[PDB]
Amino acid sequence: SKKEVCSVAFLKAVFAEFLATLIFVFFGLGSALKWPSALPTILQIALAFGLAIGTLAQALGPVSGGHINPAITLALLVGNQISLLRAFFYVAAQLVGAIAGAGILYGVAPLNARGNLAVNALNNNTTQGQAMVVELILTFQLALCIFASTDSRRTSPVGSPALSIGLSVTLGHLVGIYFTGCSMNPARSFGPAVVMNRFSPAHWVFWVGPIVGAVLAAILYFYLLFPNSLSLSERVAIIKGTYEP
Amino acid sequence: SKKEVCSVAFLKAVFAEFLATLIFVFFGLGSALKWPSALPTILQIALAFGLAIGTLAQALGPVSGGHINPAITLALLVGNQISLLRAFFYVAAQLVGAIAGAGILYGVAPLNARGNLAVNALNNNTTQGQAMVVELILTFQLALCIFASTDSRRTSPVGSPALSIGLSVTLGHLVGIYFTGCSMNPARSFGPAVVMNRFSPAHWVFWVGPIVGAVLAAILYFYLLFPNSLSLSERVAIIKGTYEP
Amino acid sequence: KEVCSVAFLKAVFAEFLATLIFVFFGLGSALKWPSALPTILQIALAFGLAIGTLAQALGPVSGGHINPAITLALLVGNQISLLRAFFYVAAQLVGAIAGAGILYGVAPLNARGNLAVNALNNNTTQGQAMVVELILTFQLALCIFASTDSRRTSPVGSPALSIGLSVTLGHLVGIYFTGCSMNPARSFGPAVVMNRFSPAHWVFWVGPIVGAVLAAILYFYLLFPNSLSLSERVAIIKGTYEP
Amino acid sequence: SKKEVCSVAFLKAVFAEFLATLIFVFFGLGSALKWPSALPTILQIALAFGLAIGTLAQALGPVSGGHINPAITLALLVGNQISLLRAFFYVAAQLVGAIAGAGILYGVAPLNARGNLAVNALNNNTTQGQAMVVELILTFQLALCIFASTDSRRTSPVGSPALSIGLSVTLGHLVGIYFTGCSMNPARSFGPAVVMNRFSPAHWVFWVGPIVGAVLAAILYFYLLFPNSLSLSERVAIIKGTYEP
Numbered sequence: 001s002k003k004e005v006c007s008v009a010f011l012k013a014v015f016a017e018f019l020a021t022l023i024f025v026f027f028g029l030g031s032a033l034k035w036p037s038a039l040p041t042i043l044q045i046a047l048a049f050g051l052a053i054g055t056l057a058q059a060l061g062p063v064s065g066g067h068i069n070p071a072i073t074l075a076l077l078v079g080n081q082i083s084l085l086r087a088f089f090y091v092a093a094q095l096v097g098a099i100a101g102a103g104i105l106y107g108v109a110p111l112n113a114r115g116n117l118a119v120n121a122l123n124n125n126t127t128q129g130q131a132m133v134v135e136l137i138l139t140f141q142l143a144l145c146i147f148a149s150t151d152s153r154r155t156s157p158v159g160s161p162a163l164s165i166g167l168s169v170t171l172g173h174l175v176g177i178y179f180t181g182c183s184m185n186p187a188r189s190f191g192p193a194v195v196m197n198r199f200s201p202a203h204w205v206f207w208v209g210p211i212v213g214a215v216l217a218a219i220l221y222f223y224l225l226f227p228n229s230l231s232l233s234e235r236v237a238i239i240k241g242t243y244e245p
Numbered sequence: 246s247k248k249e250v251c252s253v254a255f256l257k258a259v260f261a262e263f264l265a266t267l268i269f270v271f272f273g274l275g276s277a278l279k280w281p282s283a284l285p286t287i288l289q290i291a292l293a294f295g296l297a298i299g300t301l302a303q304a305l306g307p308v309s310g311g312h313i314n315p316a317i318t319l320a321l322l323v324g325n326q327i328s329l330l331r332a333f334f335y336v337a338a339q340l341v342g343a344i345a346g347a348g349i350l351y352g353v354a355p356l357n358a359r360g361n362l363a364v365n366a367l368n369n370n371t372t373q374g375q376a377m378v379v380e381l382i383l384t385f386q387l388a389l390c391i392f393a394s395t396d397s398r399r400t401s402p403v404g405s406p407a408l409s410i411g412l413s414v415t416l417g418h419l420v421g422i423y424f425t426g427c428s429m430n431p432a433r434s435f436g437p438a439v440v441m442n443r444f445s446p447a448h449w450v451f452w453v454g455p456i457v458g459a460v461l462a463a464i465l466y467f468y469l470l471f472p473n474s475l476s477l478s479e480r481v482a483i484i485k486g487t488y489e490p
Numbered sequence: 491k492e493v494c495s496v497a498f499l500k501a502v503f504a505e506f507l508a509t510l511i512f513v514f515f516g517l518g519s520a521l522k523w524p525s526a527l528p529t530i531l532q533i534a535l536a537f538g539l540a541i542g543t544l545a546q547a548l549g550p551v552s553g554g555h556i557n558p559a560i561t562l563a564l565l566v567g568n569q570i571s572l573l574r575a576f577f578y579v580a581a582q583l584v585g586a587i588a589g590a591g592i593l594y595g596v597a598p599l600n601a602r603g604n605l606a607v608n609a610l611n612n613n614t615t616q617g618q619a620m621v622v623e624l625i626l627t628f629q630l631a632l633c634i635f636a637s638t639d640s641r642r643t644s645p646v647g648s649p650a651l652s653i654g655l656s657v658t659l660g661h662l663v664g665i666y667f668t669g670c671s672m673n674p675a676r677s678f679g680p681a682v683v684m685n686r687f688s689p690a691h692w693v694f695w696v697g698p699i700v701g702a703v704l705a706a707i708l709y710f711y712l713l714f715p716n717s718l719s720l721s722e723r724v725a726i727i728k729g730t731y732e733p
Numbered sequence: 734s735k736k737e738v739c740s741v742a743f744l745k746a747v748f749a750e751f752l753a754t755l756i757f758v759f760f761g762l763g764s765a766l767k768w769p770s771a772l773p774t775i776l777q778i779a780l781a782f783g784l785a786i787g788t789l790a791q792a793l794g795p796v797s798g799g800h801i802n803p804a805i806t807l808a809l810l811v812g813n814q815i816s817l818l819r820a821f822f823y824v825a826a827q828l829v830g831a832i833a834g835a836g837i838l839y840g841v842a843p844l845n846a847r848g849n850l851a852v853n854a855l856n857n858n859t860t861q862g863q864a865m866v867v868e869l870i871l872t873f874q875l876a877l878c879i880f881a882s883t884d885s886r887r888t889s890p891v892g893s894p895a896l897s898i899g900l901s902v903t904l905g906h907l908v909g910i911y912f913t914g915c916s917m918n919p920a921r922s923f924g925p926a927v928v929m930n931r932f933s934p935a936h937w938v939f940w941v942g943p944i945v946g947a948v949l950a951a952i953l954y955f956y957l958l959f960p961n962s963l964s965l966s967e968r969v970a971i972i973k974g975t976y977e978p
């Protein structure tokens with residue numbers, strides 16, 4: 001744990017997530033601004049967020065896990081895949097990341113296109129609870145795809161974990177956008193909300209629905225469909241980050 | 246088979262065939278809703294349906310084979326690929342899943358969006374028989390792609406079965422939406438048709454079209470082009486669930 | 491020899507069958523549906539995805555040419571035999587006719603129009619069009635040849651999807667000039683089905699074939715040649731090369 | 734090095750780079766013309782430019798490395814793993830094919846759609862600095878993904894390096910077009926310019942932004958994240974072109 005956190009490997013892994021979430025938020029928000037020029041369409045926006053995740057999973061996945069999402073990091077914590085300290089620093093990183101990325105976009109978009117910087121937001125004729133359950137489901141399917149696409153034990157041809165995973169997030173947007181703007185990711189939500197100093201009463205849903213959805217997926221997969229056999233000592237070791245590097 | 250049906254893995258498989266179809270119908274109908282906000286276009290809808298199955302195939306395929314469609318399950322039966330009891334259970338789980346999927350969406354979509362909850366629906370301009378033959382074609386190429394994509398034997402690079410298969414679905418909507426709203430799957434149709442007690446006519450088309458095209462592709466793939474060498478009796482054994490290779 | 495084989499007979503039926511479905515999907519996806527006129531990207535992905543799928547699905551039976559221009563190219567590149575090429579191109583053409591027909595008999599009157607036949611940009615001359623078609627079919631073919639080279643050591647990802655998106659790419663430019671053929675069978679099929687042969691039709695044979703053949707010679711002779719010996723190359727053509 | 738510059742393969746590679754850039758400029762420019770017949774939309778264009786690279790990468794990458802972009806060539810020079818001279822002819826070949834490809838479209842494009850020939854051009858609401866940061870960031874993610882997808886030491890599944898790389902350029906277009914019309918490639922910007930005699934006052938952006946972001950991605954990836962054991966001065970044998978005989 002002191003050994004874990006005090007790796008260059010770890011320092012790198014923490015940096016990869018910051019920079020990944022930075023780049024991810026830049027691109028995702030940037031693609032959804034109401035460019036007067038040409039106003040982004042549902043499909044355009046959904047493939048933009050997804051290709052962002054596919055591209056960063058591919059490019060930086062090797063360095064950290066390519067989590068780029070506090071809900072999937074907390075989930076992976078629940079599923080006994082990472083140490084407590086990895087989860088914590090990752091979430092920080094993703095949140096700091098999300099804010100810097102939103103930061104740079106604010107900085108470079110014309111007055112014209114800045115709008116409210118693509119903050120998530122309800123349909124208005126959509127209720128909070130609804131929002132809440134839609135987001136649970138959007139995130140649930142993503143996590144599942146994620147756990148399945150990176151399981152070292154998987155026997156069937158995996159294809160491209162990166163593109164399956166990114167296109168899974170475009171699928172999420174293809175419905176999510178109509179309910180909430182589509183969060184699926186507490187950091188994607190936090191970022192614009194900070195930077196701009198815009199927080200809606202519903203903002204909590206963008207934290208709750210994603211995390212609960214991911215964690216439900218983590219409990220289903222890792223402990224119901226494909227549990228492994230380790231000792232409580234080894235389980236403990238994971239959480240205390242002692243099990244191994 | 247007593248030992249087959251009662252096994253824990255089977256109980257997972259049936260759960261997964263249920264879980265998927267539900268999630269698939271959720272995203273499927275949900276992306277197809279006449280959102281006043283921005284009407285889904287046709288590429289929009291097709292990509293959402295394709296990436297749901299692709300996603301789902303990646304995620305729960307290693308659990309059940311991830312049929313997520315009666316036509317295909319039925320066709321793997323006929324092709325001597327699965328046991329009669331995995332076939333009945335798979336179909337039942339699918340039909341119920343689709344119902345719950347239409348069910349959660351119904352309760353989640355705003356009244357302005359709900360509409361007829363994306364039920365299939367032959368175009369006034371087209372004969373049933375007309376409809377019947379395109380849903381035949383549409384599920385024929387899906388079936389072929391699936392079998393080809395998921396065969397043990399195949400020596401040529403398969404790439405991504407899940408993404409290949411997913412985009413097979415998408416392709417099918419690019420033509421299919423124009424005649425029937427693209428069925429290619431008895432449960433996707435039966436689902437919404439149930440949550441709304443408004444089945445409509447030609448619905449049979451949505452059963453026999455897909456199932457026939459599926460079955461035809463089994464015939465050709467498994468008995469015409471790439472037959473197996475299973476014993477005359479070995480076949481009965483896969484029918485009963487006692488086969489062991 | 492070949493022909494007289496259940497292997498070669500299955501192949502050819504594969505090419506017939508694949509072209510059918512390919513043509514059905516391509517054309518019906520390009521018809522003028524009044525509820526929603528098929529857009530350019532929409533159309534490009536229907537053609538692209540059809541080939542992606544058919545090659546994934548039927549590719550192991552035949553090699554999935556689904557294109558007389560490719561087949562001839564392979565011949566020229568010494569990758570297939572003379573009879574192989576004869577019978578396939580044969581099959582593709584009739585398979586395409588078949589596919590246009592099934593669609594013609596199935597599309598609603600208000601949709602049928604055209605029937606998605608290839609057709610020149612009006613402000614485009616046949617020579618202009620000839621070069622574009624050349625080019626469109628050139629990139630596609632070397633996508634094919636590189637993606638099905640057994641000597642390839644670089645990870646090939648998905649040859650099927652790479653090749654399908656290759657088609658898609660051709661449409662995104664090509665549709666604006668010629669409606670994008672890239673495939674004489676594709677253009678031949680609806681034309682037979684609805685008489686109406688264009689005065690530019692030759693473009694739709696010559697352009698795609700020349701461009702593919704150019705790519706065949708580039709890749710198999712200039713880029714990635716084999717050792718195959720004079721007499722052993724001729725056995726390639728006579729459909730008796732083992733090795 | 735006369736060792737490699739005089740090789741028949743160097744020859745083939747220098748030439749493929751020419752051929753690939755040519756075809757890539759033909760297609761990207763060609764897709765993005767206004768075309769009154771049907772104005773190309775943003776995603777339409779994002780996909781065209783992307784599938785062009787993913788295609789050409791697949792086709793011609795084993796011949797040359799398929800850089801098709803002076804910014805990524807120079808970055809590969811910066812991060813080591815190509816020689817100075819390979820870099821010179823590659824960048825020379827890219828600029829000539831770009832011009833070569835822009836010319837052939839000019840020759841082929843009908844009057845009412847030619848324009849312009851799809852030159853890059855700042856948003857008038859966009860600051861040259863602003864546009865530069867954006868281009869920096871756009872090529873940075875692309876260059877990062879390229880390096881990650883072509884690293885021989887990579888262990889986790891790479892999926893399709895060609896289609897990832899391809900979808901990465903598509904990603905960068907879905908934001909970049911609204912800003913600079915999306916360069917990410919000095920050669921794409923240079924080609925049409927030469928042919929139309931249009932060097933916008935902000936031309937510098939299309940080179941320096943893309944080349945910085947690239948080099949930056951190459952420094953991080955090669956020298957910080959995934960450093961190679963060797964070192965030392967067999968690095969100058971890299972530069973000199975005489976390494977690993």
Ligand SMILES: CCCCCCCCCCCCCC(=O)OC[C@@H](COP(=O)(O)OC[C@@H](N)C(=O)O)OC(=O)CCCCC
Pocket residue numbers: 047154155156157158159160163292402403404405408535644645646647648649651780890891892893896
């Ligand atoms: C609307 C427009 C949107 C466009 C969507 C575009 C998305 C298209 C998706 C294409 C991605 C295809 C990915 C794709 O084709 O990936 C294919 C796999 C090949 O698997 P494998 O046998 O090498 O790995 C071992 C395997 N048995 C296992 O199980 O691990 O990629 C790899 O992992 C390596 C590639 C090397 C090839 C020699």
